[PDB]
RNA sequence: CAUCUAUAAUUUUGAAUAAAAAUUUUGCCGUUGCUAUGGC
């Protein structure tokens, strides 16, 4: 009858469940489980299933999608709260119904159910923008038409499950109520070139960080529909963003090759620059091949509150820690070298040897771009993806000083616009679905369409772990 | 109007072909044919 | 059948171009035909009845509306013709036809007629109108319908009643309240 | 109208540094890079809307 | 292939592409083979960047003639899609021209890259 | 649209005078100059004390507004 | 969101239609079987 008594009752129920599951495991432990459930907010990687994974037997499945060039994807997964004990989902029908949202250049928002890890993602609902939402002023701050009219580019689903928020080239940002997909609120970015390029929610919260291509990072509170803040400091388009449970975020600004970490409340930022030199690399290899030099930094994700990984556009995956300004462990061409152009087509002249000379041997080879990169939060595995038609799963060492290639997954084919993961099962036995939004073109511009057999779709790989 | 469209498209492809044939020692009916097919497909679109 | 339709439409044309003691006997014969009918030939027949009703009302109103009700979009259109051409007598027609009534489409057309009439004096019309509301509430009591449906009718009648009471002046229906 | 980084500057002699000269832009308060248009524009708009009404 | 003779290495390619994006931003850059030839005719070009994997190579290979005729530095870079990113457009570009303007903020950059291009020539 | 932020820095817990003394940053965009009464209300909400216990003073608005 | 309703599942009556309880992977084209994969 009392709130304190209610909370005691729920907690004792929690303990009954924990003891039953501990006995099940048996057929220290309870303290350990409680300590982990605490250990989420202390931002040290604790989730260490790095080697229990069975990559070779992961079950792969493509699922084609109608619209062309899916741009991005965002997965929503209900958890159980530990302060209170109700649930993460909103209503009561849901009770742990795993959702996914995909946004496509064709101006389409599509929500699927992926609850069952054995059947295909089922297309629940969708909403399509279009030309009828073009603003009548077209030349002012107000841009507030209830739909998208250009190139939805990123999506993010709110951790409480009520809204999903999308933004793209139209310089808007729209929050939808999830069930009816109905647009509940529209916020302009109010800048002539303020295109939204990435969205990230601070975990378990309603603070959304929108990396926008006017060199700025806007920050909104969604449960109040307002823009808290703008953060300045980049030199090129702020191409990608990622945030975790703390009051921080990390961004990569593309051409300045610069990864910046934003501690919001302190109002401070830390600058991380790469800086490999190919000739130094050559000297080092003589002391001990091709050494491309870093073009731009494309994608980012925090593995932890103190460590984050940045994939560039020259095949490099770097692992950075907040302590040292240089990366602590860089890793070379991740997805291999881009295949050689054909001699006949490079030359335009029937002399075969002339055409080969045209191909020039090595000097025209280029590395695959890291187009997508994702680290399962506070864990020691991360998934990298390019348009080499194969996701690469990697495991970080225990000392957090290096990482190795755990394995591959060859079901994908095309440009991997975005990667996401969903967990399910019991705390001991956890199934991992890896979703990837795949399309024919890179999500920002075209630049590339010649890929053998790319198809617009959702690539789902279910992984199980034993040991 | 589409007369002007097609004329100018043809002029572009013609200039490219001239470049190829001038700077290639022994040019290739392959590029000639593919470029002609490109113009033909555009014309069919019209 | 087709001969009957031809006769019907010829009557339609001749009356549209254009007596009562020979325009009401065909009306009587037509109610007889409509009740006898009450198959695609029959549907297009009922259409022809509706058309000639539209013509005659353009230039026994009770059972005329009866046949109109128990005979879709065409029906609503001819109802709009009824309200635009023709009102206290219309109100008595409404009350009597409701008493006859007490299905879904007939009820919906009935509510449309009520809303059209009320948006289209009031002291004279009031008492039968309030008796009509009494009858509709008794219909709520005894109707073979679903909760959502009956509530739809309920909200509609409350809206129309609010409109009519707003129209009427207060001191005259004080005793009515 | 012109804010360096986040901070409006209205001194013409300001000696931008290197990164600052990368960051110059229009201020988030300007009718040029942001909020509602200035007084002349919205006075003209009021005039035209009123004259349309009359 | 010596037809695309001066081909930049990784470092020079970095600085070239960086100044190319800078000029695209301050709008001192003309994108495309045809417009590049037009600037070349008008003698307003500070220098020329070309792709090295065009299909085929001659379509832009016409340019070095006018370049080294009128004494305008030119240089090849490995990938046309990279050049397109650097320019800031949705499609791969094969040849771009950095124009000349005294009232430019990127003056000193363009002059450094042009210096190194000339040395390489 | 308008979302005032209150954030604190340099918190020094001074138990000699039985208090916590800190430095307040108030982010008000598209607004002028949040009130001391509202500052005290929200500071009390955050610090779980009584508006009669909270006190603030010395607020200076930076050139250009919003903070 | 809750509720009601709708669709679809059983129960009962009737051989069954019928009757009501009551209850709770694609835009376009292609290959391919009992799902997988081509091209635009």
Spanning CA of A61 to C1' of G32, the rounded length in angstroms is 17
Q: Determine phi and psi for E40, rounding to 5 degrees.
A: -65, -45
> Exposed, middle or buried by CB within 10 Å (0-12, 13-18, 19+), for D45?
exposed
Helices B29-45, B2-23: crossing angle, 10 deg rounding: 170
CA–CA separation, E8 and E49 (whole Å): 10
> Exposed, middle or buried by CB within 10 Å (0-12, 13-18, 19+), for A16?
exposed
CB atoms within 10 A of CB C176: 12
CB atoms within 10 A of CB C43: 11
CA–CA separation, A210 and A212 (whole Å): 6
Give C117-123 contacts, CB < 8 A, sequence gap 24+: C117/C83, C117/C87, C117/C90, C117/C91, C118/C160, C118/C163, C118/C164, C118/C167, C119/C163, C120/C83, C120/C87, C122/C164, C122/C167, C122/C168, C122/C169, C123/C168, C123/C169, C123/C172, C123/C173
Joined together, the tokens standing for residue C145 give 């319908």
Do the Cβ atoms of E87 and E19 come closer than 8 Å? no
Do the Cβ atoms of A195 and A178 come closer than 8 Å? no
Which of E56, E75, E105 would you mutate first to test chain A, the one with the most A CBs within 10 A?
A: E56
Helices C61-70, C104-119: crossing angle, 10 deg rounding: 130
**Look-up of token digits 């999506």:** A155
CA–CA separation, A392 and A412 (whole Å): 11
Can you spell out the DSSP letters for F5-60? EEEEEEEEEETTTTEEEEEEEEE-SSS----HHHHHHHHHHHHT--TTT-------
E61 touches chain B (CB under 8 A): yes
Do the Cβ atoms of A256 and A244 come closer than 8 Å? no
Joined together, the tokens standing for residue C132 give 């009509």
SS3 A405: strand
Do the Cβ atoms of A164 and A176 come closer than 8 Å? yes
Nearest partner of E6 among E56, E77, E71, judged by Cα: E77
Do the Cβ atoms of E47 and E113 come closer than 8 Å? yes
CB atoms within 10 A of CB A466: 8
> Exposed, middle or buried by CB within 10 Å (0-12, 13-18, 19+), for A242?
buried
E22 touches chain A (CB under 8 A): no
Do the Cβ atoms of A430 and A465 come closer than 8 Å? yes
Residue A385 parent element (H or E): strand A381-385
Nearest partner of E32 among E69, E70, E63, E72, judged by Cα: E63
Could you list the beta-strand ranges (E) of E4-44: 29-31
Q: Please tell me which chains touch F, using 3 or more CB pairs under 8 Å as the contact test.
A: A, D
Phi-psi region of A26 (alpha: psi -120 to 50; beta: other; left: phi over 0): alpha
CA dihedral sign, ordered C107, C113, C117, C122 = negative
In sequence order, what are the residues at sequence separation of 6 or more whose Cβ sits closer than 8 angstroms to the Cβ of residue C123? C168, C169, C172, C173
F-chain residues near A225 (CB < 8 A): 1
A-chain residues near E55 (CB < 8 A): 341, 345-346, 348
Helices C24-37, C40-58: crossing angle, 10 deg rounding: 150
A247 touches chain D (CB under 8 A): no
Task: Report the largest interatomic distance among the alpha carbons of chain E, rounded to a whole angstrom.
Answer: 39
Q: What is the number of H-type helices and E-type strands within chain A?
A: 5, 28
Q: From the list E10, E85, E91, which residue is nearest A278 (CB)?
A: E10
Can you spell out the DSSP letters for A88-114? SSSSSS-SS--EEEEEETTTEEEEEE-
Nearest partner of A394 among A416, A412, A379, judged by Cα: A379
In sequence order, what are the residues at sequence separation of 6 or more whose Cβ sits closer than 8 angstroms to the Cβ of residue A356? A343
Do the Cβ atoms of E49 and E7 come closer than 8 Å? no
CB atoms within 10 A of CB A375: 27
End-to-end CA distance of chain A: 45
Distance of alpha carbon C93 from its chain centroid, rounded? 8
Beta strands E74-77 and E45-51, pairing class: parallel
Bridge partners (DSSP) of residue A438 are A416, A457
CB atoms within 10 A of CB A304: 22
CB atoms within 10 A of CB F67: 16
CA–CA separation, A431 and C36 (whole Å): 71
Can you spell out the DSSP letters for A168-199? ETTS--EEEETTTTEEEEE-----TT--EEEE
Helices E33-42, E63-70: crossing angle, 10 deg rounding: 20
Bridge partners (DSSP) of residue A369 are none
With touching defined as 3+ CB pairs under 8 A, do chains F and A touch? yes
Could you list the beta-strand ranges (E) of C42-129: none
Report the half-sphere exposure of A342 (CA within 13 A, side-chain side).
5
Helices E107-120, E10-26: crossing angle, 10 deg rounding: 140
CA–CA separation, E30 and E50 (whole Å): 12
Residues near strand G (C-beta below 7 A) are A 61-68, 90-93, 120, 122-123, 179, 411, 413, 452-453, 455; C 146-148
Q: What is the number of H-type helices and E-type strands within chain E?
A: 6, 4
Spanning CA of A432 to C1' of G10, the rounded length in angstroms is 36
Nearest partner of A230 among F27, F10, F23, judged by Cα: F27
SS3 A325: coil
Residues in chain E: 121
CA–CA separation, F67 and F27 (whole Å): 4
Do the Cβ atoms of A272 and A323 come closer than 8 Å? no
SS3 E36: helix
Could you list the beta-strand ranges (E) of E14-90: 29-31, 45-51, 74-77
In sequence order, what are the residues at sequence separation of 6 or more whose Cβ sits closer than 8 angstroms to the Cβ of residue C160? C111, C114, C115, C118
Joined together, the tokens standing for residue D14 give 């300001």
Q: Determine phi and psi for E79, rounding to 5 degrees.
A: -120, 130
Task: For each of the domains in chain E, give its residue range(s) and CATH number, in order of start.
Answer: 1-121 (3.30.1330.30)
In sequence order, what are the residues at sequence separation of 6 or more whose Cβ sits closer than 8 angstroms to the Cβ of residue B13? B35, B38, B39
Helices E10-26, E80-87: crossing angle, 10 deg rounding: 40
Do the Cβ atoms of A443 and A71 come closer than 8 Å? yes
**Look-up of token digits 């006190």:** F55
Distance of alpha carbon C90 from its chain centroid, rounded? 9
> Exposed, middle or buried by CB within 10 Å (0-12, 13-18, 19+), for C47?
middle
Angle formed at CA C30 by CA C26 and CA C36, multiple of 5 degrees? 145
Distances A445 to A300, E31, E80 between C-alpha atoms, Å: 19, 16, 14
CA–CA separation, E16 and E24 (whole Å): 12
End-to-end CA distance of chain D: 36
Nearest partner of A305 among A40, A78, A50, judged by Cα: A40
Spanning CA of C144 to C1' of G18, the rounded length in angstroms is 21
CA dihedral sign, ordered A204, A208, A213, A215 = negative
Resolution (A): 3.8
How were these coordinates obtained? cryo-EM
Annotate E80-105 with b (16+ C-beta within 10 A) or e (fewer). Answer: bbbbbbbbbbeebbbbbbbbbbeebe
Nearest partner of A118 among A393, A464, A355, A411, judged by Cα: A464
Residue C111 parent element (H or E): helix C104-119
Can you spell out the DSSP letters for chain D? -EEETTEE---TT----HHHHHHEEE-TTSSSSSSS--HHHHHHHHHHHHHHH-
CB atoms within 10 A of CB D42: 12
Annotate E13-52 with b (16+ C-beta within 10 A) or e (fewer). Answer: bbebbbbbbbbbeeebbbbbbeebbebbeeeebbbbbbbb
Angle formed at CA A381 by CA A375 and CA A382, multiple of 5 degrees? 40
A215 touches chain D (CB under 8 A): yes
Nearest partner of A305 among A439, A202, A394, A210, judged by Cα: A202
Omega of the bond leading into E56 within 30 degrees of 0 (cis): yes
**Look-up of token digits 């002349």:** D40
Nearest partner of C55 among C30, C89, C38, C91, judged by Cα: C30
In sequence order, what are the residues at sequence separation of 6 or more whose Cβ sits closer than 8 angstroms to the Cβ of residue C174? none
Spanning CA of A455 to C1' of G29, the rounded length in angstroms is 15
Chain B: closest CA distance from residue A446 (Å): 20
> Exposed, middle or buried by CB within 10 Å (0-12, 13-18, 19+), for A115?
middle
Distance of alpha carbon E50 from its chain centroid, rounded? 5
């Amino acid at each position: 009858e009392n709130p304190a008594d209610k909370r005691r009752r729920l907690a004792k129920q929690y303990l009954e469940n924990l003891k039953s599951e501990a006995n099940d495991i048996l057929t220290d432990i309870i303290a350990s489980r409680l300590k982990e459930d605490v250990a989420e907010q202390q931002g040290r990687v604790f989730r260490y299933f790095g080697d229990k994974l069975l990559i070779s037997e992961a079950k792969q499945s493509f699922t084609r999608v109608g619209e062309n060039n899916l741009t991005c994807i965002s997965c929503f997964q209900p958890v159980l709260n530990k302060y209170t004990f109700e649930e993460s989902s909103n209503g009561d029908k849901n009770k742990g119904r795993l959702f996914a949202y995909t946004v496509s250049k064709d101006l389409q928002l599509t929500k699927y159910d992926i609850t069952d890890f054995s059947k295909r993602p089922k297309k629940l609902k969708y909403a399509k923008g279009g030309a009828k939402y073009i603003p009548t002023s077209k030349h002012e701050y107000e841009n507030t038409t209830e739909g998208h009219y250009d190139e939805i580019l990123t999506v993010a689903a709110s951790p409480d499950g009520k809204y999903v928020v999308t933004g793209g080239r139209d310089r808007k940002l729209i929050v939808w109520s999830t069930e009816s997909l109905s647009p509940v609120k529209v916020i302009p970015t109010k800048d002539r070139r303020g295109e939204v390029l990435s969205l990230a929610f601070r975990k378990n919260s309603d603070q959304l960080y929108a990396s926008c291509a006017d060199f700025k990072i806007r920050t909104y509170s969604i449960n109040q529909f307002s823009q808290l803040e703008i953060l300045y400091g980049h030199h090129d388009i702020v191409e990608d963003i990622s945030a975790l449970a703390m009051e921080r975020c990390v961004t990569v600004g593309a051409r300045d090759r610069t990864a910046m970490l934003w501690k919001i409340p302190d109002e401070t930022r830390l600058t991380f620059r790469g800086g490999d030199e190919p000739q130094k690399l050559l000297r080092r290899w003589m002391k001990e091949p091709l050494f491309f030099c870093e073009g731009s930094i494309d994608v980012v994700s925090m593995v932890d509150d103190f460590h984050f990984i940045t994939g560039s556009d020259n095949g490099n995956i770097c692992l950075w820690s907040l302590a040292k300004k240089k990366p602590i462990f860089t890793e070379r061409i991740a997805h291999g070298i881009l295949p050689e152009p054909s001699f006949n087509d490079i030359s335009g002249e029937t002399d075969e040897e002339l055409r080969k000379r045209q191909l020039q041997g090595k000097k025209l080879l280029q590395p695959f771009w890291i187009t997508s990169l994702y680290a399962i939060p506070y864990s020691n595995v991360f998934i990298s993806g390019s348009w080499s038609g194969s996701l690469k799963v990697w495991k970080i060492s225990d000392n957090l000083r290096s990482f190795e290639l755990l394995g591959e997954l060859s079901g994908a084919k095309g440009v991997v616009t975005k990667i996401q993961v969903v967990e399910s099962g019991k705390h001991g036995k956890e199934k991992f679905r890896i979703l990837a939004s795949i399309a024919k073109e890179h999500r920002l511009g075209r630049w590339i369409a010649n890929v053998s057999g790319a198809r617009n779709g959702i690539y789902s790989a279910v992984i199980d772990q034993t040991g | 109007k589409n007369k002007g469209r097609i004329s100018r498209y043809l002029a572009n492809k013609c200039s490219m072909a001239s470049r190829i044939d001038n700077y290639s020692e022994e040019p290739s009916n392959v590029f000639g044919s593919v470029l002609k097919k490109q113009v033909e497909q555009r014309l069919e679109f019209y | 059948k087709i001969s009957s339709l031809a006769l019907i439409t010829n009557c339609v044309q001749v009356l549209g171009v254009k007596f009562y003691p020979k325009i009401v006997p065909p009306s009587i014969k037509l109610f007889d035909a409509s009740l006898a009918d009450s198959n695609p030939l029959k549907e297009q027949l009922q259409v022809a009845i509706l058309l000639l009703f539209a013509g005659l009302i353009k230039r026994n109103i009770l059972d005329v509306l009866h046949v109109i009700y128990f005979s879709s979009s065409i029906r609503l259109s001819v109802i709009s013709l009824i309200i635009e051409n023709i009102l206290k007598e219309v109100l008595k027609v409404l009350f009597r036809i409701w008493s006859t009534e007490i299905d879904t489409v007939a009820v919906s057309l009935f509510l449309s007629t009520l809303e059209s009439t009320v948006e289209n004096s009031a002291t004279s019309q009031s008492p039968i109108f309030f008796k009509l509301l009494l009858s509709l509430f008794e219909f709520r009591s005894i109707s073979s319908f679903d909760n959502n449906t009956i509530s739809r009718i309920e909200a509609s009648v409350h809206e129309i009643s609010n409109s009519y009471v707003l129209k009427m002046n207060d001191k005259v229906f004080r005793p009515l309240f | 109208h012109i804010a360096v980084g986040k901070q409006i500057v209205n001194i013409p002699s300001f000696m931008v540094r290197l990164d600052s000269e990368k960051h110059i832009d229009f201020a988030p308060t300007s009718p040029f890079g942001g909020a509602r248009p200035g007084r002349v524009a919205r006075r003209n708009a009021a005039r035209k809307a009123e004259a349309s009404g009359e | 292939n010596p037809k695309a003779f001066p081909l930049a290495d990784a470092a020079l390619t970095q600085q070239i592409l960086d100044v190319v994006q800078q000029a695209a931003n301050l709008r001192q850059l003309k994108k495309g083979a045809n417009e590049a030839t037009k600037t070349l005719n008008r003698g307003i070009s500070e220098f020329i960047i070309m792709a090295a994997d065009c299909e085929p190579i001659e379509i832009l290979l016409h340019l070095p003639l006018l370049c080294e005729d009128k004494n305008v530095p030119y240089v090849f870079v490995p990938s046309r899609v990279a050049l397109g990113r650097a320019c800031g457009v949705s499609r791969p570009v094969i040849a771009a021209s950095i124009t000349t303007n005294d009232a430019s903020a990127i003056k000193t950059q363009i002059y450094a890259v042009k210096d190194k291009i000339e040395t390489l020539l | 649209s308008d979302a005032v932020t209150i954030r604190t820095r340099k918190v020094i817990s001074n138990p000699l005078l039985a208090r916590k003394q800190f430095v307040v940053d108030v982010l008000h965009p598209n607004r002028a100059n949040v009130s001391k009464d509202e500052l005290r209300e929200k500071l009390a909400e955050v610090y779980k004390a009584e508006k009669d216990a909270v006190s603030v003073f010395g607020f200076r608005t930076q050139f250009g507004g919003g903070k």
